[PDB]
Amino acid sequence: RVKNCNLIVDCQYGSTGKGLLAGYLGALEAPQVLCMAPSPNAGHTLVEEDGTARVHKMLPLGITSPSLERIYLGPGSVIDMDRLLEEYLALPRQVELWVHQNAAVVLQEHRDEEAAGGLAPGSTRSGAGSAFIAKIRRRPGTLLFGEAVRDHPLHGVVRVVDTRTAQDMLFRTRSIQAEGCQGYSLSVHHGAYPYCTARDVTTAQLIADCGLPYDVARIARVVGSMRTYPIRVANRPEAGEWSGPCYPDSVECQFADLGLEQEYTTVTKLPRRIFTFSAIQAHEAIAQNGVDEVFLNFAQYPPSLGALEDILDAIEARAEVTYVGFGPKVTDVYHTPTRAELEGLYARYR
Amino acid sequence: RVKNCNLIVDCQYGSTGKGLLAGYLGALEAPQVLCMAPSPNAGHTLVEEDGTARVHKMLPLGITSPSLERIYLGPGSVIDMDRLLEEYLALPRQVELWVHQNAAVVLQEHRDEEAAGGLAPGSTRSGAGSAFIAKIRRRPGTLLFGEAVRDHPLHGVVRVVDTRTAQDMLFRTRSIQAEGCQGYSLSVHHGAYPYCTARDVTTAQLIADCGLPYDVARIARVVGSMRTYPIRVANRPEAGEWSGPCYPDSVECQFADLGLEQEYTTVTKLPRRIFTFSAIQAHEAIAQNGVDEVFLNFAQYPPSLGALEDILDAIEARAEVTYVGFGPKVTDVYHTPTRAELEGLYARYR
Numbered sequence A, B: 001r002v003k004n005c006n007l008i009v010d011c012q013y014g015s016t017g018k019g020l021l022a023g024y025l026g027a028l029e030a031p032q033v034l035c036m037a038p039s040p041n042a043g044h045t046l047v048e049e050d051g052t053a054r055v056h057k058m059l060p061l062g063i064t065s066p067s068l069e070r071i072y073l074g075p076g077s078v079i080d081m082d083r084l085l086e087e088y089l090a091l092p093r094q095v096e097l098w099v100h101q102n103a104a105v106v107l108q109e110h111r112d113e114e115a116a117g118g119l120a121p122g123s124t125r126s127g128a129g130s131a132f133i134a135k136i137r138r139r140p141g142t143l144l145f146g147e148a149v150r151d152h153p154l155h156g157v158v159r160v161v162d163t164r165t166a167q168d169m170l171f172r173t174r175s176i177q178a179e180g181c182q183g184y185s186l187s188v189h190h191g192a193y194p195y196c197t198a199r200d201v202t203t204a205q206l207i208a209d210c211g212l213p214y215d216v217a218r219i220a221r222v223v224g225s226m227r228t229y230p231i232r233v234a235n236r237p238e239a240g241e242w243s244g245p246c247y248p249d250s251v252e253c254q255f256a257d258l259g260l261e262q263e264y265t266t267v268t269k270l271p272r273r274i275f276t277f278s279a280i281q282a283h284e285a286i287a288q289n290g291v292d293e294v295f296l297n298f299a300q301y302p303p304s305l306g307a308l309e310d311i312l313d314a315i316e317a318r319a320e321v322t323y324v325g326f327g328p329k330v331t332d333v334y335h336t337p338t339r340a341e342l343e344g345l346y347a348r349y350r
């Protein structure tokens, strides 16, 4: 019964625009089921045609799919139940929300622990690491989602499921979209430790955390997202935290070098760090993840068309650049543009 | 260049005989590279024709391969450097040992922490959970393998590698064998929490922790190992620990019910727990892992040939039983026996 499965994986340090990619593919491929293993580290963003933004930390953004029936948050999820309930109630259309019983739960004590600092440099301090560690530690009395939610208003809108139930549902689903979060180079396996997150960030880890059965993974297509200028989170110098290195064929630059205003963080108001494109990073992530199609986003950032074409050429040595993003809306993503069309798009978006 | 990749995954609670399976497939398929992401929870066993046992906690057991060139311990490894050095020096033939720089390391403090009890019921108390959590927590000063080994005699016999180096090596390898450890139903995602280990135990997690590139995983064959009678570790009643449930279509039994002597644990001398076969568990693990070939081991345990054939019939509803084990040696494993041949083997091994 399964005919299509798209896996969306971030090939840099996050913030490549996976909320946009998810919305775009949701409309293009019309999946019936969205899978995700969210953690509350950052909010992914879908900007509507009218300029309104929907920001999701706990739910996928393929909700543009006209065929959407169900969202399944897998056992590798790390769930803020308050935030999940809030995002669910705000959804535009009614859909079933299934959550695996063994997902971790984020409690205030986990946020409190990370708020004291002294852990990963540049940590979002979302509590995600502490919450996940509590699941992994298996101390008596630790409750995973299946038990923790019974105490919480969220229980009235979720179906708690085990893997037998999830398997049956997924094998009966025609088109599946699974949305990764974070970034390949934040992988605790493949990143520059300790400038990284608490888990691996690969196609394989996404399959594991979403609980996708391996025969479905075998037919899946992998869409890798990357920016023209990779970005890391801000430093926290008062806490003595530098948020980490770039690849050796990247150099750190300033937003002003692109004629852009500095990008600050949502709450703390700290300047994000930007770097030039790394072909080594792109090729390494493409190979690790088995990327079949690349989404190259922020194609309007390079200061010349030649600079954009050099990035395209680097990627295309290893994978097709199937989707090109010139802005934050679904209507700003273009499917396999010719080089001639690319010229017109670049000029128009600058 | 990659032509063959076999992934060995345990479909029950461990102790299905993956050391035997690895030795058998190593000789059958002659891989050039063995991949593993070991943790020190238990020792896997290869019994030689003469009755000698080799017990590995840190190294694969496909070392029967006449074409073996290299062992690669992936970034998801959790490494006791003393034990790894000891096992490496005892290997029969010279091979290259590569270890990913981001593997976790087990220190005495991790063993000490788990030795105090009060964590997962039935824990092996190997320190594996604490050591892995230290990697995940990213506290300043925590050293992963790449830095921790420089202080240790092991550094003289290992090549520390990153993912770019591992990728290049793996893509140039004709035949790869990756050996899972632990058991599907010990998965922190798919198991009965907290009667489980610290990570997922699936094909997907194995790919992630071994650092196998996804395009290699795509061509891989999955060999799932299972026993006629699933087994859990012993209870620890003095510590108030029960080691956990079986599936609902299994019932706990006694070794005496099979005419066998009680199986005790290597050090603590505690009785292992045995249960009848669960078809639900088998089918669930086959589906989650995408198992293509099943190794059914301990085929000499069922008290009648009909009881063995019922187990075979249950498995074969979903996957071929390709290998059948009637004893602990490579010469006790039989490839796709006919039912008539099975009759003679069962009679002879009883």
Ligand SMILES: Nc1ncnc2c1ncn2[C@H]1C[C@H](O)[C@@H](COP(=O)(O)OP(=O)(O)OP(=O)(O)O)O1
Pocket (backbone or CB within 6 Å): A010, A014, A015, A016, A017, A018, A019, A020, A042, A043, A044, A045, A046, A181, A182, A297, A298, A299, A325, A326, A327, A328
């Ligand atoms: N091509 C684009 N041009 C300008 N802004 C864009 C473009 N694509 C996306 N954006 C905006 C939307 C968000 O405000 C921001 C980051 O996108 P977002 O979807 O939140 O990233 P993400 O989900 O990949 O990673 P993160 O984990 O950092 O949230 O960039």
Ligand SMILES: Nc1ncnc2c1ncn2[C@H]1C[C@H](O)[C@@H](COP(=O)(O)OP(=O)(O)OP(=O)(O)O)O1
Pocket (backbone or CB within 6 Å): B010, B014, B015, B016, B017, B018, B019, B020, B042, B043, B044, B045, B046, B181, B182, B297, B298, B299, B325, B326, B327, B328
């Ligand atoms: N068919 C068999 N009959 C009898 N003994 C066997 C058979 N196959 C293997 N053994 C023995 C070898 C070991 O002493 C024991 C468990 O095997 P072993 O390779 O250590 O398990 P394993 O690696 O799958 O799991 P564990 O994590 O418990 O070590 O069973």
Ligand SMILES: Nc1nc2c(ncn2[C@H]2C[C@H](O)[C@@H](COP(=O)(O)O)O2)c(=O)[nH]1
Pocket (backbone or CB within 6 Å): A013, A014, A015, A041, A042, A120, A121, A122, A123, A124, A125, A126, A128, A129, A181, A182, A183, A186, A195, A196, A197, A198, A232, A233, A243, A244
């Ligand atoms: N852009 C982005 N960065 C993340 C995300 N999760 C973690 N990071 C980065 C921020 C830090 O550089 C590093 C560690 O953060 P944390 O996992 O929150 O402790 O990983 C995410 O979802 N998006």
Ligand SMILES: Nc1nc2c(ncn2[C@H]2C[C@H](O)[C@@H](COP(=O)(O)O)O2)c(=O)[nH]1
Pocket (backbone or CB within 6 Å): B013, B014, B015, B041, B042, B120, B121, B122, B123, B124, B125, B126, B128, B129, B181, B182, B183, B186, B195, B196, B197, B198, B232, B233, B243, B244
């Ligand atoms: N047979 C076996 N059991 C294991 C292994 N690792 C963990 N377990 C089981 C023992 C307990 O029931 C449970 C938790 O143990 P631990 O991960 O050591 O805290 O998982 C392994 O490698 N082999």
